[PDB]
C-alpha cells in the first residue's frame, strides 16, 4: 500500500517501540527483537486486591 | 479515633506471571511484546519496495519476456518475491552463483 | 507477601484511594477519607520507571536480518545457518521470559516492602500515643484533628505534644 | 539469614517436627509436642513447586543435534561451526549455573522470610497476654491448654478472652 | 532501603567508624567512640567476597579468537560469520551489564538487611532496660560503663543484672 513504516515484515509492517515482537523473524528497518513468546507482561504496579 | 496505612487497588484485569505464582492480577503493568501489524507491505523512508510479482530475481535481471513491467524499475527500499515468483530462467540452465548474486543485490 | 504486609497483615486494597500506590486512611470526628503518601509513592514511581527503562535499554533494537538462500549442495552450511538462527532465538526467548518472571517477583516484593517501611515509620513516631489495632491501623490514645492528621503524613508528628494527654488516657485501661 | 530468623534469632531446626517446613512447639501441663503449620507450609510447598516447574519450562528439551563433517579445504567453515558449537555451549553452561546460584539464595531467603512472617503474625495476636522469651518463643501470662493451643495455630486466638487473666498476672512482675 | 534501615530510619553514615561496615556508637560518662561489629562485618566481608568470585568464575576467560577472511564469492558465509560474531557479542554484553545492574541492587539490599538484623538483635536484648530513642539508638534506663559497653557488642548483655535498676528508673516517667 501507499503506506509508511520504520519496520517491515513479510506479514506486514510494525509500528511500535516495544523491545520484543512475535510476528516474524524476518525484519527490515529498525524492529523489535523477534521471540517465540506469546505473552511478556511486566508488572509495574502491585498486586490488585479489591474484595 | 484512628489512622491506617494501606495500598492502592482498582478495576484492572492485568495478569502477570512470577516465579512463585501464576496469573497474578496487578494494579499496573506494561506489555513488552508487540504482536500487531499492518497487514501490508509499506514504504521504508518513503521509498517503495520493488514488487517482482510473478517474476523472480533471475527473470528481472535477465529480462525474461514476462517481466516487462519491471523494465522501468530503478530504485527500491527492499525487494519482494511472492509465492508466484516463477518466471525466471525461461531457457533451461544453471544460473551460476545465483545465491551470491542475490546476496549481492541485498545491499 | 515476602514482607508480610500485602496479602498479609494488611489484608486488602483501597479502591477508595486513587491518589497513589501507598496511603493512609483516617477517621477524625470531623470526617473520613484517603490521602496517598507523596514521598513513598513518588519514589516507587521513580524507581519502577527506572526499572522498566533499564531493562529496555539492555535491548538493542533488531536491525535488518533477512534469511539466506542456499543451493542443494550446501545443505551443511544451510544447516549451520539454521542452527545459528535457532540457537540465538532460543537464547533470546529464554532471556526475555525468564527475566520477566524473576523481575515480576522482585517488583511485587518492592511494593510490599515500601508499605512495611511506611507502617513502621509511623509506628516509630506514635508508640504509646496510640495502639496497634490490627491490619495496619493505629488507635489514638488522644483526640486528634484533620490538621493534626497532616502531621502524621508529614513525618513530623509531635510525640511530646500529646504524650501527656495520651498517658492519662492509656493508664485507664 | 537475610531475614534474621533462620540461623538467626531462631538458632536451630526441629528434627522432631516432621509434619512440614514451618511449625510451632508447645508445652502445656498436659504435655509437649510439634504441630506444623498448614497454611504457610502448603504455600511454600506450592510456590517452590511452581518455581522449579517454571525454571524447567524455560528449557525447551534438546532435539537431534549431530555434528557436521568437513573436508580439508573447509577449515574456515569447520572452525566457524566449532565457534558456534562452543559459543552456545558457553552460554548455556553459564545460564544454567548462574541461575542455580542466584536462585538458591532467593529460595533460602523465601523460607527465612515465611518463618519471620509466621512469628510476627503470632506476636501481633498475643501482645500483653505473653512475653518475648527469645528464639521465637512466647511465654503465656495465663494458663492455656491443648484445645487452646489450637486457637493459636488457628490464627483465631481470642485476645480478650484471656486479657483479664493475663493483666493481673503480668502486673505482679 | 528495601529494609528501611539505610537511608531510612538510620539516616546517615559514620565517617568516624573506620573499623568495618557495621558498628555501634556509644557515649558513657567515661567518654565517646566507635566500635565496629566483628561477627557481622566479617560475615558480610566473607559473603560479598564469595559473591564477586562466584560471578567471575562463571566467566571462562576468552582464548585466541581471530577473525576469518573470505573472498568475494563468499559473501553469504562472510555474513553468516558476522552474524555469529555479532550475535554472541550482543549476548555477552547483555549478560554482563544486566547481571551487574540486578546484582548491585541485591548487594545494597544485603547491607541494609545486615544492619536491620544487628539493630533488632540488640533490641531483643535490651527491651525495658532501654528505650527506642530514634535513628538506631537506645537509651539506657540504667547507668552503664565501657566494660559494660563490651557486653552489648558481645551479644551477652545480662538483662537481669540491670532489670532491677532500670525498673525503678523507668517507672519514674
Ligand atoms: C503509528 O500509528 C499511530 C496511530 O495509529 C501513531 O501514533 C500517533 O503519534 C503521533 C506523533 O507522536 C501523534 O501526532 C498522533 O496523534 C498519534 N495518533 C493517535 C491516533 O493518537 C504514529 O504516528 C504511527 N507511526 C508510524 C511510523 O506509522
Ligand atoms: C487468570 O485469572 C482470571 C481471573 O481471575 C481467570 O479468569 C477465568 O478464566 C476461566 C477459564 O478460562 C473462565 O472460564 C472464568 O470465567 C474466568 N474467571 C474470572 C473470575 O474472570 C483465569 O482462570 C486465569 N487464567 C489462567 C490461564 O489461569
Ligand atoms: C475502570 O476505570 C475507569 C476509570 O478510571 C472506568 O471508566 C472503566 O469503565 C473501569 N472499568 C471497569 C471494568 O470497572
Q: Is E55 in the C-facing interface, judged by CB distances under 8 Å? A: no
C-alpha span between D135 and E124 (Å, rounded): 10
What are the CA-CA distances from residue D113 to residues C109, D1, D39, D120 (Å)? 12, 9, 15, 11
Q: What is the pairing mode between strands D130-132 and D138-140?
A: antiparallel
Residue D102 backbone phi and psi in degrees, to 5: -60, -50
- Contact call for residues A19 and C56 (beta carbons, < 8 A): yes
- Cell numbers 544454567 correspond to D96
* Angstrom distance (rounded) from CA C27 to CA C12: 18
Q: Which residue has the cell 477508595?
A: C16
Rounded Cα distance, D170 and C61, in Å: 67
Q: Which residues contact D135 (CB under 8 A, 6 or more apart)?
A: D9, D10, D11
Write phi, then psi, for E13 (nearest 5 degrees): -90, 160
Asked if E8 has any chain C CB less than 8 Å from its own CB, the reply is yes
Residue position matching grid coordinates 516432621: D18
The whole-angstrom distance between C147's CA and the closest CA on chain D is: 30
Secondary structure (3-state) at E14? coil
**Dihedral of the CA atoms D78, D82, D84, D86 (nearest 10)?**
180
Cα distance between residue C8 and residue D114, in whole Å: 11
CB < 8 Å to B21, chain D: 46-47, 50
Say which DSSP state A7 is in.
E
HEC string of chain C? CCCCCECCCECCECCCCCCCCEEEEEEECCEEEEEECHHHHHHHHHHHHHHHHHHHHCCCCECCECCCCCCCCCHHHHHHHHHHHHHHHHHHHHHHHHHHHHHHHHHHHHHHHHHHHHHHHHHHHHHHHEEECCCCEEEECCCCCHHHHHHHCCCCCCCHHHHHHHHHHHCCC
Nearest to C126 by CA among C93, C163, C91, C98: C163
Write the DSSP symbol of residue B18.
-
Please say whether the beta carbons of D26 and D10 come within 8 A.
no
Choose, out of D57, D65, D84, the residue to mutate when testing the contact with C (most C CBs < 10 Å).
Answer: D84
Q: Taking CA atoms, what residue in E is nearest to B97? A: E73
Whether D163 and D128 have beta carbons less than 8 Å apart is answered as yes
Cβ distance of E73 and B103 shorter than 8 Å: no
Residue E29 to residue E143: CA distance in whole angstroms: 9
Burial of residue D171 (CB within 10 Å: 0-12, 13-18, 19+) is exposed
Q: How far, rounded to the nearest angstrom, does the alpha carbon of residue B104 sit from its chain's CA centroid?
A: 20
> Given the DSSP bridges, would you call strands B2-7 and C22-28 parallel, antiparallel or unpaired?
antiparallel
* CB of residue A29 inside a 6 A radius of ligand 1: no
Closest ligand relative to B27 C-alpha: 3
Ligand nearest to the CA of B9: 3
Does residue B12 line the site of ligand 2, with CB under 6 A?
A: no
Q: Distance between CA C157 and CA C126 in Å, rounded?
A: 8
Tell me whether residues C124 and E101 touch, CB distance under 8 A.
no
Rounded Cα gap, residues A9 and C117, in angstroms = 49
Distance CA C34, CA B4 (A): 10
Burial of E50 (0-12, 13-18, 19+ CB in 10 A): exposed
B100 and E75 within 8 Å at the Cβ level: the answer is yes
Q: Do D54 and B21 touch (CB under 8 A)?
A: no
The answer to whether the Cβ–Cβ distance between E117 and D4 falls below 8 Å is yes
Cell 494501606 identifies what position?
Answer: B6
List CB contacts (< 8 A) between B24 and chain D: none
Host H or E run for residue A27: none
What number does CATH give the domain C1-173?
Answer: 3.90.20.10
Question: Under 8 Å CB-to-CB from B93, ≥6 apart: which residues?
Answer: none
Q: What's the D56 CA to ligand 2 centre distance in angstroms?
A: 24
The set of cell numbers assigned to C113 is 516492602
Determine the length of chain C: 173
| Ligand 1 neighbourhood includes A38 CB (under 6 angstroms) | no
* Cβ pair A49, B9 in contact under 8 A: yes
Nearest to E23 by CA among E127, E157, E164, E149: E149
Length of chain A: 51
| Coil/strand/helix, residue D86 | helix
Q: How many CB atoms lie within 10 A of CB C86?
A: 14
Q: How many CB pairs under 8 A join B and E?
A: 10
Contact C4 D84 (CB under 8 A): no
Cα angle, residue E63 at apex, residues E58 and E66 outer, rounded to 5°: 135
Strand partners, E49: none
Determine phi and psi for B80, rounding to 5 degrees: -110, 125
| Strand stretches in chain B, DSSP E | 2-7, 14-16, 24-26, 29-31, 33-34, 43-44, 50-51, 79-80
Task: Say which of C17, C68, C74 has its CB closest to residue B6.
Answer: C17
Residue with cell 503470632: D122
Task: Tell me if chain C has a CB within 8 Å of the CB of E79.
Answer: yes
Q: For residue A5, which atom of ligand 1 is closest to its CA?
A: 27
Please give the helix or strand (H or E) that residue E25 lies within, else none: strand E23-28
Find out whether the beta carbon of B104 lies less than 6 Å from any atom of ligand 2: no
Q: How many CA atoms lie within 13 A of E82 on its CB side?
A: 8
CA angle E101–E102–E104, rounded 5-degree value: 70
Ligand 2 binding pocket includes B17 (Cβ within 6 Å)? no
What's the grid cell of residue C114? 515500601
* β-strands A33-34, D31-36 pairing: unpaired
| CA B46 vs CA A29, B49, B72: distances in Å | 12, 10, 19
Residue C105's CB is within 10 A of a number of other CB atoms, namely: 22
Q: Which of E1, E77, E79, E132 to mutate to test the interface with C (most CBs of C within 10 A)?
A: E77
Q: Does A36 touch chain B (CB under 8 A)?
A: no
Do the chains contact at D68 and C79, CB–CB below 8 Å? yes
User: The C-alpha cell of C77 is what?
Assistant: 552450511
Which residues lie below 8 Å from residue E167, measured CB to CB, with a gap of 6+?
E128, E141
Burial class (CB in 10 A: 0-12, 13-18, 19+), D118: buried
Resolution in A: 2.8
- The C-alpha atoms of residue E100 and residue E16 are separated, in whole angstroms, by 30
Ranges of each domain in chain E: 1-173
**Nearest to residue B9, comparing CAs of D8, D50, C16?**
C16
> From the CA of B14, how many Å to the nearest CA of chain A?
9
Chain A, 6 to 45: residues with Cβ < 8 Å from chain C are: 19-20, 25-37, 40-45
Are C107 and B3 contacting, i.e. CB atoms less than 8 angstroms apart? no
Enumerate the residues of chain A whose CB falls inside 8 A of the CB of residue B36.
14, 16, 23
Ligand 1 neighbour A6 (Cβ under 6 A): yes
Between vectors from CA D86 to CA D84 and to CA D92, what angle results, nearest 5°?
100
- Say yes or no for a CB contact (<8 Å) between E73 and B100: yes
Cβ contacts of B30 on chain C, cutoff 8 Å: 52
User: For testing the chain B interface, which of C12, C62, C69, C132 should be mutated: the one with the most B CBs within 10 Å?
Assistant: C69
Distance of residue E69 Cα from the nearest chain C Cα, in angstroms = 17
Burial class from Cβ neighbours inside 10 Å (0-12, 13-18, 19+) for residue D78 reads: middle
What is the CB neighbour count within 10 angstroms for residue E124? Answer: 14
Amino acid at each position: 500500500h501507499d503506506c509508511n513504516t520504520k519496520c517491515q515484515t513479510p506479514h506486514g509492517a510494525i509500528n511500535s517501540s516495544l523491545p520484543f515482537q512475535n510476528i516474524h523473524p524476518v525484519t527490515i528497518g529498525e524492529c523489535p527483537k523477534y521471540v517465540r513468546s506469546t505473552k511478556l507482561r511486566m508488572a509495574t504496579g502491585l498486586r490488585n486486591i479489591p474484595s | 479515633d484512628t489512622i491506617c496505612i494501606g495500598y492502592h487497588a482498582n478495576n484492572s484485569t492485568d495478569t502477570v506471571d512470577t516465579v512463585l505464582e501464576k496469573n497474578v492480577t496487578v494494579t499496573h503493568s506494561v506489555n513488552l511484546l508487540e504482536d500487531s501489524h499492518n497487514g501490508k507491505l509499506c514504504k521504508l523512508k518513503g521509498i517503495a519496495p520493488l514488487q517482482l510479482g510473478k517474476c523472480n530475481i533471475a527473470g528481472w535481471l535477465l529480462g525474461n519476456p514476462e517481466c516487462d513491467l519491471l523494465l522501468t524499475a530503478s530504485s527500491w527500499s527492499y525487494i519482494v518475491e511472492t509465492s508466484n515468483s516463477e518466471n525466471g530462467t525461461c531457457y533451461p540452465g544453471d544460473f551460476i552463483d545465483y545465491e551470491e548474486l542475490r546476496e549481492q543485490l541485498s545491499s | 507477601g515476602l514482607f508480610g504486609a500485602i496479602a498479609g497483615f494488611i489484608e486488602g486494597g483501597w479502591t477508595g484511594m486513587i491518589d497513589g500506590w501507598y496511603g493512609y486512611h483516617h477517621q477524625n470526628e470531623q470526617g473520613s477519607g484517603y490521602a496517598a503518601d507523596q514521598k513513598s509513592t513518588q519514589n516507587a514511581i521513580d524507581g519502577i520507571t527506572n526499572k522498566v527503562n533499564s531493562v529496555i535499554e539492555k535491548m538493542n533494537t533488531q536491525f535488518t536480518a533477512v534469511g539466506k538462500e542456499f543451493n542443494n549442495l550446501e545443505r551443511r552450511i544451510e544447516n549451520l545457518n539454521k542452527k545459528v538462527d535457532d540457537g540465538f532465538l532460543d537464547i533470546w526467548t529464554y532471556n526475555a521470559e525468564l527475566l520477566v518472571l524473576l523481575e515480576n517477583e522482585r517488583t511485587l516484593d518492592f511494593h510490599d516492602s515500601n508499605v512495611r517501611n511506611l507502617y513502621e515509620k509511623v509506628k516509630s513516631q506514635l508508640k504509646n500515643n496510640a495502639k496497634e489495632i490490627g491490619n495496619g491501623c493505629f488507635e489514638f490514645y488522644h483526640k486528634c484533628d484533620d490538621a493534626c492528621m497532616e502531621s502524621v503524613r508529614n513525618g513530623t508528628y509531635d510525640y511530646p505534644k500529646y504524650s501527656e494527654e495520651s498517658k492519662l488516657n492509656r493508664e485507664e485501661i
